[PDB]
Amino acid sequence: QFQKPGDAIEYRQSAFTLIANHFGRVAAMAQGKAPFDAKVAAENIALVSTLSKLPLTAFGPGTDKGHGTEAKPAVWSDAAGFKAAADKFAAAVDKLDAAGKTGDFAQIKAAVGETGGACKGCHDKFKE
Amino acid sequence: QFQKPGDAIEYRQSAFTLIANHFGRVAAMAQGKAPFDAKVAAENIALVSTLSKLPLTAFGPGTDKGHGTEAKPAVWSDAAGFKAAADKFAAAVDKLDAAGKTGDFAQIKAAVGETGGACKGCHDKFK
Numbered sequence A: 001q002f003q004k005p006g007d008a009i010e011y012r013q014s015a016f017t018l019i020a021n022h023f024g025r026v027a028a029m030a031q032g033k034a035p036f037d038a039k040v041a042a043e044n045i046a047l048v049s050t051l052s053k054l055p056l057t058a059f060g061p062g063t064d065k066g067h068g069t070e071a072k073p074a075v076w077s078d079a080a081g082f083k084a085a086a087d088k089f090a091a092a093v094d095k096l097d098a099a100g101k102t103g104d105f106a107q108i109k110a111a112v113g114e115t116g117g118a119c120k121g122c123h124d125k126f127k128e
Numbered sequence B: 001q002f003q004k005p006g007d008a009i010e011y012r013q014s015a016f017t018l019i020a021n022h023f024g025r026v027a028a029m030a031q032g033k034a035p036f037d038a039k040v041a042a043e044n045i046a047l048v049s050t051l052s053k054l055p056l057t058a059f060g061p062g063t064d065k066g067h068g069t070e071a072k073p074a075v076w077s078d079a080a081g082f083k084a085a086a087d088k089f090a091a092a093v094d095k096l097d098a099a100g101k102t103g104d105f106a107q108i109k110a111a112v113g114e115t116g117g118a119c120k121g122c123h124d125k126f127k
């Protein structure tokens, strides 16, 4: 529930910020930049999964301008494309969740690559 | 985690924004502004509980700059005070979490009050 458009914009931005931080902690392990700790990786993946379900709920009508938004007009004019990019992300996060459950480093690394590609694919089309 | 101190600031601000939104949904039910739905209340309480564990991890040394911030210097120069305020909040959130699991309206409402008091108590001294 968002009382003004500014509230939706600040909410989605906030959720993306937290997603990026926790995802990046997992990515650092996967990329061989930090030691691997499966329990910590799982905890951060679980947070990414919970958070991933939030921002894309906050792109309602009239939330396209102001408040520092970087959402492109295509988010609303190509709503089906935006939903497809969101569904691609959700599917990738499902794989990341599965990987966190198994603890399998190779499966985590694969899911990190796939998930990262879903972030970039949506940004390329929908984010300034 | 935080590469730059600005990353900590943006992180804690972001967590607080999400906490306020989801807590506000529970509060609206406690105040009788929205019909009570124990399942939905429990979902929002669960999110508040998860999120509540995040922002207070992002007030490390040197994070009074690197991005715009409303954190008062006392966060760092009255660290015991800030910790007491954080612990009061965590205790209240613990009760909120328990209340969400019972689905008892009265227990949720009481924990909403205690939790909101903890938000305000910290802000009065530190924001």
Ligand code: HEC
Residues within 6 Å of the ligand: A009, A012, A013, A014, A016, A017, A019, A020, A023, A056, A068, A069, A070, A071, A072, A075, A082, A085, A086, A089, A115, A116, A118, A119, A120, A122, A123, A126, A127
């Ligand atoms: C579309 C389906 C997206 C997916 C998948 C991801 N992001 Fe994104 N992001 C998207 C938009 C339209 C915006 C702009 C939001 C606005 O209104 O301004 C963003 C923004 C971000 C940000 C910036 C937050 C800020 O500066 O306040 C970050 C850090 C970010 N996104 C990260 C991110 C990551 C790591 C993702 C995958 C794990 C990801 N996003 C997915 C659209 C979409």
Ligand code: HEC
Residues within 6 Å of the ligand: B009, B012, B013, B014, B016, B017, B019, B020, B023, B056, B068, B069, B070, B071, B072, B075, B082, B085, B086, B089, B115, B116, B118, B119, B120, B122, B123, B126, B127
């Ligand atoms: C101290 C122990 C705090 C408790 C408990 C709560 N908050 Fe707070 N909050 C605190 C600080 C020091 C700041 C400033 C952070 C900064 O670096 O700027 C905040 C900020 C907020 C915000 C604003 C976020 C923004 O505009 O980007 C909100 C919406 C907020 N806090 C809400 C909030 C709620 C609802 C709380 C209880 C459920 C709560 N905070 C607790 C310190 C503390």
